Amino acid sequence: GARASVLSGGELDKWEKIRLRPGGKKQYKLKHIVWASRELERFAVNPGLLETSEGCRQILGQLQPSLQTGSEELRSLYNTIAVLYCVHQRIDVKDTKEALDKIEEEQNKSKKKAQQAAADTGNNSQVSQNY
């Protein structure tokens, strides 16, 4: 994967400063971005969007609701992209854990604007209990 860089000289240094795990000590590497960039192309999405914070925000917004039935490929993508998006918004995370949660807080304020469907719902969906 080498169609076009995604992170800048500055973001690159901050990208390698992001830990993959909460307790682990393994930082992030291009292998993680390059992989996603070559993945989006398979999801009918151009890798030229990852270069812009707006592109990611839009990509994640699609996988978010797909997390329910998203194969491993979807998981790795969301997690990875999540860490990248944070960088584009000049946000420094402690790990792939605090990064995923951080994106939930910044989006929470947005969901409040479109929380008309969540409430006053009238459609009993299938209920499960298998963890």
Domain limits of the chain? 8-115
Half-sphere exposure of residue 21: CA atoms within 13 angstroms, side-chain side: 4
CATH dotted code for 8-115: 1.10.150.90
Rounded to whole angstroms, the Cα distance separating 32 from 71 reads: 17
**CA distance from start to end of the chain:** 37
Of 88, 66, 87, the closest CA to residue 77 belongs to 66
Residue 27's DSSP bridge partners are 19
Please name the residue that has the structure tokens 């947005």.
110
Sign of the alpha-carbon torsion through 8, 83, 14, 31: negative
Residue 72 one-letter amino acid? E
Rounded to whole angstroms, the Cα distance separating 58 from 126 reads: 28
